[PDB]
């Protein structure tokens, strides 16, 4: 029979006021004989209607994939409102329900600290510039690198690790050609998180 999967908005979308966050209620393993679905969406127990059905995808294992997207306000989400999708289909003796929401827990400001390469990496061809984000709750975050207004793409980031105070931490690392680090260039580490002033902070790093 059919199955339901309810996914949250991207952290960026909930944090950039100029983006458009949305929950996505996916329905897989959907039969040809009764492909029809009903969605009812509820926000904090109370029904809403501005749902939308994205176009039906044929799966090539003979099942259909029907998906419902609900748009949601930034502030509703960030205040921990609960979003319930309910799915009903003829091949499903009882409707299925799923809830999601922001992880419950008092929000905590991330502490952001940049870190120059080891005197020891200096020999090697390429160097690692580190951004450390610690002491943040909840774990929904975005980290980006840049220099002179411009995105640097050779970075990598660790999944948020649970600390022993109950907060989260991660390290983001960017690799540049050594000479560039030498050449006086200035790199920036951009962190977007809810418990921050304007959901955004930035930190720079350079030679000395």
């Amino acid at each position: 029979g059919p199955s339901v999967f309810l996914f949250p908005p991207k952290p960026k979308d909930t944090l950039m006021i100029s983006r458009t966050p949305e929950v996505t209620c996916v329905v897989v393993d959907v039969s040809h004989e009764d492909p029809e679905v009903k969605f009812n969406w509820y926000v904090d127990g109370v029904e809403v209607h501005n749902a939308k059905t994205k176009p039906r995808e044929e799966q090539y294992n003979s099942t259909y994939r029907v998906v419902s997207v609900l748009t949601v306000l930034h502030q509703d989400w960030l205040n921990g409102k609960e979003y319930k999708c309910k799915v009903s289909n003829k091949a499903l003796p009882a409707p299925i329900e799923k809830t999601i929401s922001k992880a419950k827990g008092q929000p905590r400001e991330p502490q952001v600290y940049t870190l120059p390469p080891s005197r020891e990496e200096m020999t090697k061809n390429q160097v690692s510039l580190t951004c450390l984000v610690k002491g943040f709750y909840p774990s929904d975050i975005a980290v980006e690198w840049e220099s002179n207004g411009q995105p640097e793409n050779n970075y990598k980031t660790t999944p948020p690790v649970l600390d022993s105070d109950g907060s989260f931490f991660l390290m983001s690392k960017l690799t540049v050609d050594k000479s560039r680090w030498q050449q006086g260039n200035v790199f920036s580490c951009s962190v977007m998180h809810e418990a921050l002033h304007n959901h955004y902070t930035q930190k720079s790093l350079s030679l000395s």
């Binding site: 944090l15 950039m16 995105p151 977007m192 304007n198 959901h199 955004y200």
Partner: peptide, 13 residues
Amino acid sequence: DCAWHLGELVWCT
């Protein structure tokens, strides 16, 4: 104040 990201508005309180 307001924060901008890659010249795209992030947030204003």
